[PDB]
RNA sequence: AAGAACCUUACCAAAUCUUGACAUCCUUUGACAACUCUAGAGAUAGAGCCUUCCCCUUCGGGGGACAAAGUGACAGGUGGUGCAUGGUUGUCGUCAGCUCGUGUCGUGAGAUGUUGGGUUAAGUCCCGCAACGAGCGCAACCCUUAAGCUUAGUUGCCAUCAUUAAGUUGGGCACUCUAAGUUGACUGCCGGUGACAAACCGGAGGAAGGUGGGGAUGACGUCAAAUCAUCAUGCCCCUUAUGAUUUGGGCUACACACGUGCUACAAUGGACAAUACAAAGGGCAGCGAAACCGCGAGGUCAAGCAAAUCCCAUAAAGUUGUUCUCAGUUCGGAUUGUAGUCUGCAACUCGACUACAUGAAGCUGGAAUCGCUAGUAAUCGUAGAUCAGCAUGCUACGGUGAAUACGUUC
């Protein structure tokens, strides 16, 4: 609950990219995670020619919502504090970048990132799905938790 | 495994002539040498002595796949 | 000219020699390549040489053992911070506002004798 | 590849020695005939060929279901 | 459950009841220590020994006997210790030497009053009278706290209870508190009554 | 039970039936044959202090 | 140089022997190195605490065996007599090298 | 039950014995008898053979210690009873509670202390008060980790050097390591909020800051919770059996319902080659060095070690290159058969494992549900015990290693 932080990686110079590195891992494999993310980042540099901090920052705002429903017996539009916003946006990015059905992860997370800049995929559809469930159940409350 | 047959003196007693009816062993560990096929054993599964006739092809196995003891 | 220090994290002993040079991580005097499997993360251990920007061209000499490779890299990070402590007494607040002399006691916790795998209580029915 | 296209079809499996491979050892389905002749020789662990207990033991009490069915 | 204090305080402040080394064989020393403690258990029926301590230095044993009645292990002037020491030399086939010391304040150690309360409850006395007189005769010597729990078929009872007459500090969790403990069984006609004496003395 | 204790303190048919008992009671299982003591009597002589050996759970 | 392997269980008897033997070799000789300690790796016995049921609670007993190594460099003939003369720790295990 | 081929074994078929398998008294004999041979499955009987006064007395004794009979007192019982029990252990629960002395109030059961305000982790304190105080529990004086130092340098470390396949020796203990002890972490100091008191928050020092982290330690008692199966007991019952020994089954069976755990269901991967790193623990009939032939389970001569030297011991996952190119497959590894290796009078009921070949569900698990707040989860090996041989179970250590905790609303 003071929610302490880990140092940023100096390959792609951001603090969001080491949270993505720590989010994509499985069974404690960090070297497998660095093997499948930096090659996906170089596939981003070889396909759409722009530095990936800008298109990753502009693509994570197409996944991130501003409303969230939390039901209790019900639905409220609570605004989200931004560390929770960015960890649910990264968790939706990995959890729909694990379910595409392609050859490797380096061609699976990277075109999902470039689909999130062109507002397609499964992640921007999940942002319109939580906006649809928060707008269809806007009517019940503004006050509950 | 190296093949032992510890009761070899019971085999060579009745071997030259016609072999006697049914001879018994209280050991299923007695590994079958290939010279007492036809020696009719009564082997012990725990309950009583169950007869077995060593016919033609059971040189490589013991006396314990024959006479079962788990029934059904 | 040869600052013999020490430093550890997670059962990984480190003994630095701070010598003036251009700078190369010589772990067991070999390389930075074969020993560490993070050749991409070679600036996690370079952290007191980028948070103290007085000079970042200094050579380290270790021949050390212990633990793994991430804990050995943060152990020689602790040895680099200990060599920057014993090199200059005015670096210390430049240490302490970034931390970096904080020995973390985060070791692998003990196997609890009723539980299965050390806060892994074995599945109540 | 060539060497891992031959592991599930009969004869050669995965770790043998290597239009040349047409010849050699028992590469056809005669080993299926030899396995059926050996299970004909045992039919004595034919009392547990309705079960899944071998010559070298199973402990079937709750799980021998690969020579059995799902619920059955 | 309540752990015993002599388990918790060996190798903290109170020393072990055996001081030797054995690494290679190691079962030919401890079981002979068990049979020599079972042989001092025959003279526990009159002598009232608290504990013996095995000092096997290299060949002979300077076994330290601690009895609250010190004049009846030695006999008249030293005969009973010598015929006892010859019986131990027969019954372990090793060399022993009896080291006796004369311990007074007999109602301050747990094993002497535990065998005394189990002796009084063998002789069909009522348990509350010997319990209150044991804790008040241990306080009129001067003690820092005496728990005395007798349990089982209480005085020839049908249902087992647990009669504990705690008095004063018996602080089992402060670990620099040298607490004597003994449980002694009493073979009464109505079963087996276990006493449990827990004396803290600072 | 002193039946099996009176049996196994004698030389036998084989040398492979010499299984481990406690040499104080008749307990057959969990016998620490470094001590030749069982599960329970090693706890009792550990708590009395008549084995030289500490209790520390401080690993 | 000769060595002794000073081997006890507890530290309460190894310090009195390591003060006795070293100063006996100092007062009867010259240049005896100190009681250099070993890592003293221990033996943990883990039993269940109960009798019949209950493997959910268990019990530890560890057995530590402390070892000091004492080196006598250039041993005088009075030292090899006077170390074997007085023997009163009563429970340490001595090996001679 | 941390070891079920015989033994365990109590249970069951057979062979049997009745002072018995064994404890003890008495008489007779006596430094015991082991070892080979016959029947038998062995237990048991039967041959060769005296080990045959070892401490000591005149010849005969006494008796450390054995054997036979009388079977006489006695055995023996893992037989029944935990609802007669001790001893021992779980759960509430490491939660913060529970009681007592004296006094007061109350006809009395009882209450007060223990409640109310604030507080923390706490019945931990402070304020006011018919309460005053005390005791078990919480808080540590206990151990380990977390930073140097006094000390002592070997089998361990190589500053600085000669020098090698090797820190392997010359030298040293510079650093490191290791341990008997020292100094420290105690809201200790400052500020704010605080009744000026308890404390909370922030900052500094410190390696660690708010019981520093983890373990042990489990109150009064509850469940008539478990154990007459470690042991003894209180009662009952047998004692040519319910006591004993041995061979063969046995706890190691399935048409099954359930609990725990492993393996996975693959591209994060499957296979091939090089290469990195440690802790913790054990070893004398045991640990098997190098080398050797073995595809391989292992086997041969075998240094060294009663243990920082010698061994288990390559720890594994990682990194670098290659293949596979998304499937019931290049995954799997159950099953069956053959060749086998090893322990052990022995692998058939029933041990571990190697090769070859067959390759069966399994392509992510519903209603429900379990565990976890930081080195945690997950994954991956290593070591100990039991063990003559046997682990995905227990125990202990180590590598990589995340987010979540708006809140406590239900």
UniProtKB/Swiss-Prot annotation, chain B:
One GO biological process term: translation
One cellular component term from this protein's GO annotations in UniProt: small ribosomal subunit
GO molecular function per UniProt: rRNA binding; structural constituent of ribosome
UniProt keyword terms in alphabetical order: Ribonucleoprotein, Ribosomal protein, RNA-binding, rRNA-binding
Family of the protein in this entry: Belongs to the universal ribosomal protein uS19 family.
Chain's role: Protein S19 forms a complex with S13 that binds strongly to the 16S ribosomal RNA.
Name the record gives this protein: Small ribosomal subunit protein uS19
Originating species: Staphylococcus aureus (strain NCTC 8325 / PS 47)
From Swiss-Prot, chain C:
GO molecular-function terms, A-Z: RNA binding; structural constituent of ribosome
Listed GO CC annotations: cytosolic small ribosomal subunit
SUPFAM superfamilies, sorted: Ribosomal protein S5 domain 2-like
Signal peptide: none
Biased composition (Basic residues): 108-125
BP term (GO), one: translation
UniProt region (Disordered), positions on chain: 96-125
Keywords, comma-separated and alphabetical: Ribonucleoprotein, Ribosomal protein
Family under the similarity heading: Belongs to the universal ribosomal protein uS9 family.
Protein name as catalogued: Small ribosomal subunit protein uS9
UniProt organism field: Staphylococcus aureus (strain NCTC 8325 / PS 47)
Gene: rpsI
From Swiss-Prot, chain D:
GO biological process, one term: translation
Gene Ontology cellular component terms for the protein in this record: cytosol; small ribosomal subunit
Signal peptide start and end residues: none
GO molecular function list: rRNA binding; structural constituent of ribosome; tRNA binding
KW Ribonucleoprotein (keyword) present: yes
Keyword RNA-binding: yes
UniProt similarity note: Belongs to the universal ribosomal protein uS13 family.
Record protein name field: Small ribosomal subunit protein uS13
Source species of the chain: Staphylococcus aureus (strain NCTC 8325 / PS 47)
Organism placement in taxonomy: Bacteria, Bacillati, Bacillota, Bacilli, Bacillales
Annotated gene: rpsM
Part of the whole protein covered: 14 to 114 of 121
Curated annotation (Swiss-Prot), chain F:
PROSITE patterns reported for this sequence: RIBOSOMAL_S14 (PS00527)
Residues given in the record as Zn(2+) binding sites: 22, 25, 38, 41
Matching Gene3D superfamilies: 30s Ribosomal Protein S14, Chain N
Superkingdom: Bacteria
Necessary cofactors: Zn(2+)
Free-text comment on the cofactor: Binds 1 zinc ion per subunit.
One GO location term (cellular component): small ribosomal subunit
GO molecular function per UniProt: rRNA binding; structural constituent of ribosome; zinc ion binding
InterPro entries documented for this protein: Ribosomal_uS14, Ribosomal_uS14_bact, Ribosomal_uS14_CS, Ribosomal_uS14_sf
GO term, biological process aspect, one: translation
Entry's transmembrane regions: none
Keywords for this protein: Metal-binding, Ribonucleoprotein, Ribosomal protein, RNA-binding, rRNA-binding, Zinc
PANTHER family: 30S RIBOSOMAL PROTEIN S14, SMALL RIBOSOMAL SUBUNIT PROTEIN US14B
Subunit structure: Part of the 30S ribosomal subunit. Contacts proteins S3 and S10.
Function: Binds 16S rRNA, required for the assembly of 30S particles and may also be responsible for determining the conformation of the 16S rRNA at the A site.
Family: Belongs to the universal ribosomal protein uS14 family. Zinc-binding uS14 subfamily.
The protein's name in its UniProt record: Small ribosomal subunit protein uS14B
Gene responsible for this protein: rpsZ
């Amino acid at each position: 609950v003071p929610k302490r932080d880990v140092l940023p990686d100096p390959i792609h110079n951001s603090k969001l990219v080491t949270k993505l590195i720590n989010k994509i891992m499985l069974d404690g494999k960090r070297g497998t995670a660095q093997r499948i993310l930096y090659s996906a980042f170089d596939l981003v540099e070889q396909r759409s020619g722009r530095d990936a901090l800008e298109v990753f920052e502009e693509a994570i705002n197409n996944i991130m919502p501003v409303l969230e429903v939390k039901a209790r017996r019900y639905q409220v539009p609570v605004e989200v504090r931004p560390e929770r916003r960015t960890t649910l946006g990264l968790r939706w990015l990995v959890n729909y970048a694990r379910l595409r059905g392609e050859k490797t992860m380096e061609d699976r997370l990277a075109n999902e990132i470039l689909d999130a800049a062109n507002n397609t995929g499964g992640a921007v559809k999940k942002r319109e799905d939580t906006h649809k469930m928060a707008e269809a159940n806007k009517a019940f409350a503004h006050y509950r938790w | 495994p190296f093949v032992d047959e510890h009761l070899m003196k019971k085999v060579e007693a009745q071997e030259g002539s016609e072999k006697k009816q049914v001879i018994k062993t209280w050991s299923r560990r007695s590994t079958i040498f290939p010279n007492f096929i036809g020696h009719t054993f009564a082997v012990y599964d725990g309950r009583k002595h169950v007869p077995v006739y060593v016919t033609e092809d059971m040189v490589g196995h013991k006396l314990g796949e024959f006479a079962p003891t788990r029934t059904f | 000219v040869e600052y013999r220090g020490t430093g550890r994290r997670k059962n990984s002993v480190a003994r630095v020699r701070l010598v003036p040079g251009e700078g190369n991580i010589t772990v067991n005097n070999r390389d930075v390549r074969e020993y560490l499997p993070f050749e991409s993360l070679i600036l996690d251990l370079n952290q007191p040489f980028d948070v103290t920007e007085t000079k970042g061209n200094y050579d380290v000499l270790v021949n050390v053992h212990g633990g793994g490779f991430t804990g050995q890299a943060q152990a020689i990070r602790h040895g680099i911070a200990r060599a920057l402590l014993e090199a200059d007494p005015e670096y210390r607040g430049s240490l302490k506002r970034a931390g970096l002399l904080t020995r973390d006691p985060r070791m692998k916790e003990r196997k609890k004798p009723g539980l299965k795998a050390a806060r892994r209580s074995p599945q109540f029915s | 590849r060539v060497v891992i296209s031959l592991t599930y079809i009969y004869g050669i499996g995965t770790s043998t020695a290597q239009r040349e491979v047409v010849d050699g050892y028992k590469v056809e389905g005669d080993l299926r005939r030899e396995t059926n002749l050996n299970i004909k020789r045992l039919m004595y662990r034919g009392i547990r060929h309705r079960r899944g207990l071998p010559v070298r033991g199973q402990k079937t009490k709750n799980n021998a279901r690969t020579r059995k069915g799902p619920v059955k | 459950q309540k752990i015993n204090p002599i388990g918790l305080r060996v190798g903290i402040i109170r020393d072990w009841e055996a001081k030797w080394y054995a690494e290679k064989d190691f079962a030919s020393l401890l079981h002979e220590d068990l049979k020599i403690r079972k042989f001092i258990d025959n003279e526990l029926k009159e002598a009232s020994v608290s504990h013996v301590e095995i000092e096997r230095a290299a060949n002979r044993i300077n076994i330290a006997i601690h009895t609250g009645k010190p004049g009846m292990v030695i006999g008249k002037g030293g005969s009973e210790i010598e015929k006892l020491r010859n019986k131990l030399n027969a019954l372990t086939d090793k060399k022993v030497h009896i080291n006796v010391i004369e311990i007074k304040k007999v109602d301050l150690d747990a094993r002497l009053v535990a065998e005394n309360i189990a002796r009084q409850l063998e002789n069909r006395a009522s348990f509350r009278r010997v319990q209150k007189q044991a804790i008040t005769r241990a306080m009129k010597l001067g003690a820092k706290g005496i728990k005395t729990q007798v349990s089982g078929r209480l005085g020839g009872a049908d249902i087992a209870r647990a009669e504990q007459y705690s008095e004063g500090t018996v602080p089992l969790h402060t670990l620099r508190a040298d607490i004597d403990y003994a449980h002694a069984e009493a073979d009464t006609t109505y079963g087996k009554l276990g006493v449990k004496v827990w004396i803290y003395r600072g | 039970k002193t039946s099996m204790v009176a049996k196994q303190q004698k030389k036998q048919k084989y040398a492979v039936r010499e299984y481990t008992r406690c040499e104080r009671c008749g307990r057959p299982h969990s016998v620490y044959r470094k001590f030749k003591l069982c599960r329970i009597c090693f706890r009792e002589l550990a708590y009395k202090g008549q084995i030289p050996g500490v209790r520390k759970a401080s690993w | 140089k000769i060595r002794i392997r000073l081997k006890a269980y507890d530290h309460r008897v190894i310090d009195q022997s390591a003060e006795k033997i070293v100063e006996t070799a100092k007062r009867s000789g010259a240049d005896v190195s100190g009681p250099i300690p070993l890592p003293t790796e221990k033996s943990v016995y883990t039993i269940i605490r109960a009798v019949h049921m209950y493997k959910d609670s268990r019990e530890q007993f560890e057995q530590r065996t402390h070892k000091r190594l004492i080196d006598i460099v250039n041993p005088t003939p009075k030292t090899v007599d006077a170390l074997m003369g007085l023997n009163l720790p009563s429970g340490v295990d001595i090996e001679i090298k």
